[PDB]
Design an enzyme around this catalytic site. Structure first.
Site, PDB file in Angstrom:
ATOM      1  N   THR A 133     -21.445  20.772 -25.440  1.00 38.14           N
ATOM      2  CA  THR A 133     -20.615  20.018 -24.508  1.00 38.14           C
ATOM      3  C   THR A 133     -19.161  19.915 -24.952  1.00 38.14           C
ATOM      4  OG1 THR A 133     -21.444  17.994 -25.570  1.00 38.14           O
ATOM      5  CG2 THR A 133     -22.480  18.656 -23.510  1.00 38.14           C
ATOM      6  N   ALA A 134     -18.792  20.515 -26.078  1.00 40.29           N
ATOM      7  CA  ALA A 134     -17.455  20.405 -26.630  1.00 40.29           C
ATOM      8  C   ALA A 134     -16.714  21.729 -26.397  1.00 40.29           C
ATOM      9  CB  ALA A 134     -17.545  19.960 -28.091  1.00 40.29           C
ATOM     10  N   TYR A 135     -16.166  22.388 -27.422  1.00 44.01           N
ATOM     11  CA  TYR A 135     -15.374  23.594 -27.205  1.00 44.01           C
ATOM     12  C   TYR A 135     -16.188  24.673 -26.498  1.00 44.01           C
ATOM     13  CZ  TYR A 135     -11.722  27.047 -28.348  1.00 44.01           C
ATOM     14  OH  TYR A 135     -10.734  28.000 -28.302  1.00 44.01           O
ATOM     15  N   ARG A 169     -12.920  42.464 -29.741  1.00 39.85           N
ATOM     16  CA  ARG A 169     -11.464  42.395 -29.775  1.00 39.85           C
ATOM     17  C   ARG A 169     -11.023  41.306 -28.810  1.00 39.85           C
ATOM     18  NH1 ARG A 169      -9.798  47.819 -31.500  1.00 39.85           N
ATOM     19  NH2 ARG A 169     -11.679  49.120 -31.688  1.00 39.85           N
ATOM     20  N   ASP A 182     -15.905  10.203 -30.855  1.00 32.18           N
ATOM     21  CA  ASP A 182     -16.692  11.264 -31.473  1.00 32.18           C
ATOM     22  C   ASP A 182     -15.989  11.845 -32.689  1.00 32.18           C
ATOM     23  OD1 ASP A 182     -18.946  11.155 -29.856  1.00 32.18           O
ATOM     24  OD2 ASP A 182     -18.059  12.473 -28.336  1.00 32.18           O
ATOM     25  N   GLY A 183     -14.655  11.825 -32.700  1.00 31.36           N
ATOM     26  CA  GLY A 183     -13.932  12.274 -33.879  1.00 31.36           C
ATOM     27  C   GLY A 183     -14.178  11.383 -35.080  1.00 31.36           C
ATOM     28  N   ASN A 213     -20.615  20.226 -34.412  1.00 38.47           N
ATOM     29  CA  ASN A 213     -20.215  20.744 -33.111  1.00 38.47           C
ATOM     30  C   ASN A 213     -20.208  22.268 -33.094  1.00 38.47           C
ATOM     31  OD1 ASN A 213     -19.984  18.371 -31.678  1.00 38.47           O
ATOM     32  ND2 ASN A 213     -17.789  18.120 -32.074  1.00 38.47           N
ATOM     33  N   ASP A 242      -9.241  36.914 -28.791  1.00 36.78           N
ATOM     34  CA  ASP A 242      -8.634  35.786 -29.491  1.00 36.78           C
ATOM     35  C   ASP A 242      -9.530  35.255 -30.603  1.00 36.78           C
ATOM     36  OD1 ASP A 242      -6.442  36.015 -27.911  1.00 36.78           O
ATOM     37  OD2 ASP A 242      -6.620  34.057 -26.940  1.00 36.78           O
TER      38      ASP A 242
END
Ligand SMILES: C#Cc1nc2c(N)ncnc2n1CC
Ligand SMILES: C#Cc1nc2c(N)ncnc2n1CC
Ligand SMILES: C#Cc1nc2c(N)ncnc2n1CC
Ligand SMILES: C#Cc1nc2c(N)ncnc2n1CC
Lengths: 261, 261, 261, 261
Positions: C158-160, C145, C45-46, C119, C147
């Site tokens: 389906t990724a991050y 507030r 996928d990359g 993505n 990260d």
């Protein structure tokens, strides 16, 4: 005894520091920021963390106390209006002390650096993908792929650990808690998901799979370490001592901070 | 010594029980299911839980052992092929014993019932909305509104506690863990969200706000209690003893069950 | 038509590329990596993401296809053994095309940069604390507030997005999903917690409260932006087109990737 | 037109109903609770749900409006002080209408029952373990083991769906969302974990593996169904129509309910 006072730097905390020093001048107290036996923090929990790390080599000879000039903190848990009463009772002495566990982080290279954490220690990559093998008491437990990992003290569980889904642990429990940051889980890559709580003498070791550069935080401090062979976590033998001058239960402190006050 | 063997009931576990009894017949062992000193469970963790509850009034005089005929269990953690080696080493005796903490549940009415849990104890409503006030060491901590609550032992943390987001705790830690089931959180109603880990001697009390009927589970047992004034949780003074005949670390048992085996 | 083939670079994918080119040489096909109408990705996928971004200005004139030489991908969802059958059917043409929504990110300064994501797009701080005001269709929704934040496309869920607790959305839904990274929630600071799913024409605006420097990612690309006044998210008017040569349902692709294959 | 008013039953809502009826008596309005064209709910969202289900066979001929006498609701989103202004504008008519999607639940036996849900429909076991096979558009997606499943409408996503970790979806999106309740995930049993968002015309089918008795809820209604062969979810063809008399955006309604008001 000998004592010192750190301030957040705003005029509320500086002027409060000067009044406590002046109040201490009416007792058998000596201002000494080299070898104090009482360390007073005026500000927030961040001010308290700097005070803890400023003196982390004299932990067994110091009782810490925190004053919150802003919102209630978990370490700076006494209000500014109680400063006069605080001065008188510290000067008379004979207070009880309470101790919280600490986390020991060891970083080895190809050269070994040890750090003490009051809240937590985190590990992230220096840019690319973060992959480490997680070893528990020499048994390979998992290959973690994700954003990073966080190992928390009991009193640190209400801080970054909480935001990551970790449990809140009463600080009388000598333990540490490992939580995941955005782990990848599919058919190929499997992590445990759940937070893990480790007792004393359990060693949690992180070992690189490919990249050897990691951004490692210890409380506020965050350093990029290069050419690391191992990151090593265990409950420290050292503890932080708090001067206790009344009853403020940890669970009440949790209630006041997250439910309502 | 005296011993007994419980079986899941399928022919795999029954035939394994008969062979171990026959193997025990070659040693100074007596079959006694009234006052045994060794309790062998053959089946799964559910078979082990029934064996534990069958003898929960002789816990300090019994060492438990579990054999899994199906998949690996956290209590039934020895394979059937090791039965012959298990028979010989139990008969010779002189094994080491390990102890896990237990959870004590007290239910009071307007009439007080106490239960011992090896995994967890849960509380849900009898139909309508579930609302209780959560009291920790006599301080009112929160008003919980949702599906229910779950208090887990350390070895129970890998069971229902895990499915609810709770942390996995090594069983050497004398503690209990409270996790929420589908809590309602808005501007009006606030719960802590995070799991809570309590040490020994901390008492967690649930008190009804309106409805007085609750469905309370203790491991497998689930009873509808009516007219309850209080549900009371604390780490039990009693512990379960396991006959230990080799090294099978808890974290390895966690790895084998959830990561891969 | 005109076509081109990108390879991950390993000898498995390069040798597969050469064989497809040779196979294409037996048809009315022209190799052109300047103005192709078919873009073939061989790798993972990359590799597919780089192919998408290499040609993101000719999206309406291109049908993408992906071949996975490693594990199954959500974009590279055809196996290398199907390459010969893939060559013949692409050459004959007359295939059906499917379209997935895309995410548009706008970064304004005191100077406006727009990016297209297949993505997701994430925002984190450049070091210190990350605080932004979240504005939805001009109404101030929350002060975040933590990260960072992540805005995902449907096929990006389906990724991050998945690792952060976000929902999986079928790609036929023209929407975007906002998920939180380690948000701070106490009595003072409140975020929504839940993922948020926005339809087309809804604009989600991030506005700095103090620090004006943010690390912004768009798929693989990650740039530190300085002196930003606003980050702006909305469903793009542009879509990515896939050459469809058989039935491989999205939910089956989800099953094969996360349940078992 | 014809209209009717339902009240929660407390004296605040009854007295408000009588005043609106009296106010309606000054216009060309007829009270008819058999074939109304305007349905006014006075109470909370629960009062609104009963009004919706009371008339769910005349949905295309009715515009609903809700008045909250307690806290702000997502359906009863107008305050009692606006009742007089509400009466005048409903009587003049010529208002705009907005429509929200609904969920259709089909229960088949060995005998087919269909239900319409405004919030969500849940499935749990009748006592023992809950195990179903999850089928999406005829492809077997997963075998779910746990407490139960929840399929939510977009406007239902702020209700039970939110407490289970589901995403909040803007109600203009014609979709439904499936969330898990306390799923069991180990080496043997695997669920997707993440919430799933399905577009129109996707059918999600639950099929029993062993036990055939399930407790099925539809909004407030909860019935024990016996001898069920299939539970079938899809976005309904029918929609609920709201009388819109000013701008109150969904995301503002989310902000007011969960962030602060
Ligand atoms: C600095 C600091 C700090 N330590 C904390 C703690 N132990 N619990 C909750 N909040 C905390 N903070 C503020 C972000
Ligand atoms: C019965 C039982 C039982 N006890 C468990 C445990 N302590 N950890 C993990 N799984 C467990 N099971 C099976 C559902
Ligand atoms: C690059 C890339 C990429 N895109 C994905 C996607 N849309 N779903 C699941 N995994 C994915 N990956 C691999 C990390
Ligand atoms: C009855 C009801 C009801 N419907 C809701 C909704 N759609 N969003 C948020 N809260 C809601 N409630 C109250 C429990």
């Amino acid at each position: 005894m000998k004592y010192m006072i750190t301030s957040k730097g705003d005029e509320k905390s500086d002027l409060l520091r000067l009044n406590m020093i002046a109040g201490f001048g009416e007792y058998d107290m000596e201002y000494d920021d080299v070898e104090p036996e009482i360390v007073i923090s005026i500000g927030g929990d961040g001010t308290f963390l700097s005070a803890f790390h400023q003196y982390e080599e004299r932990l067994d000879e110091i009782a810490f106390i925190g004053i919150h000039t802003g919102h209630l903190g978990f370490y700076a848990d006494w209000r500014p209006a109680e400063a006069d009463k605080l001065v008188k009772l510290l000067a008379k002495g004979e207070y009880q002390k309470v101790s919280y566990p600490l986390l020991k982080t060891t970083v080895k290279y190809g050269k070994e650096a040890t750090y003490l954490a009051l809240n937590e220690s985190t590990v992230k990559s220096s840019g690319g993908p973060f992959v480490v093998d997680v070893v528990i008491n020499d048994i390979h437990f998992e290959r973690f792929r994700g954003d990073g990992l966080c190992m928390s003290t009991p009193s640190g569980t209400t801080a970054y650990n909480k935001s990551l889904g970790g449990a809140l642990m009463h600080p009388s429990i000598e333990a540490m808690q490992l939580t995941e940051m955005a782990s990848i889980n599919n058919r190929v890559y499997r992590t445990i998901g759940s937070p893990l709580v480790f007792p004393k003498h359990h060693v949690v070791s992180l070992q690189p799979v490919n990249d050897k550069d990691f951004q490692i935080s210890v409380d506020h401090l965050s350093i990029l370490h290069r050419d690391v062979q191992e990151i090593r976590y265990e409950v420290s033998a050292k503890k932080i001592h708090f001067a206790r001058f009344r009853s403020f239960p940890f669970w009440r402190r949790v209630h006041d901070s997250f439910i309502e006050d």
